[PDB]
Amino acid sequence: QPVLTQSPSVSGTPGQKVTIFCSGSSSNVEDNSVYWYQQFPGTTPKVLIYNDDRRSSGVPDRFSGSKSGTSASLAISGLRSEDEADYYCLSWDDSLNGWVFGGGTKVTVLDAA
């Protein structure tokens, strides 16, 4: 099982805000950088956030990464249909001696009505 524990699936309509959580431990996210990846079906995952809160080139400011203690989050404000994807957190783990991913959180964007 994944060493990092992510939020269950979340949904929103366009314009809403969602927050995805990534919980780790003292051996991983507490002192090591967290990265966030976005993955569409049948596509390689791409880095959206690195070093806890830095946006990759081209990533909209409505994507915000943060970290506190052994917990990290990715907030997507102003949700757009193209944001529907699986999101994964990643951190180095000093005990396991590996790069560990969360199990993923699917963000679904519902048609408002």
Q: Is 68 exposed, middle or buried (0-12, 13-18, 19+ CB in 10 A)?
A: exposed
**What is the CB-side half-sphere exposure of residue 72 using CA atoms within 13 A?**
31
Those residues with Cβ within 8 angstroms of residue 35's Cβ, 6 or more apart along the chain or in another chain: 47, 49, 50, 51, 89, 90, 91
96-99 contacts at long range (C-beta below 8 A, 24 or more positions apart):
96/3, 96/27
- Cross-strand partners of 55: 49
- Cross-strand partners of 93: 98
Resolution of the structure in the document, Å: 1.5
Please give the method by which this entry was determined: X-ray
CB 11 within 8 A of CB 110: yes
CATH number of the domain at 21, please. 2.60.40.10
Number of domains into which the chain is organized: 1
3-state per-residue secondary structure call for the chain: CCCEEECCCEEECCCCCEEEEEECCCCCCCCCCEEEEEECCCCCCEEEEECCCEECCCCCCCEEEEEECCEEEEEECCCCHHHCEEEEEEEEECCCCEEEEECCEEEEECCCC
CA–CA gap between residue 33 and residue 90 (Å, rounded)? 8
CA–CA gap between residue 79 and residue 62 (Å, rounded)? 8
Angle at alpha carbon of residue 34, lines to 31 and 35, rounded to 5°: 160
**Residue numbers of the domain that contains 30:** 2-113
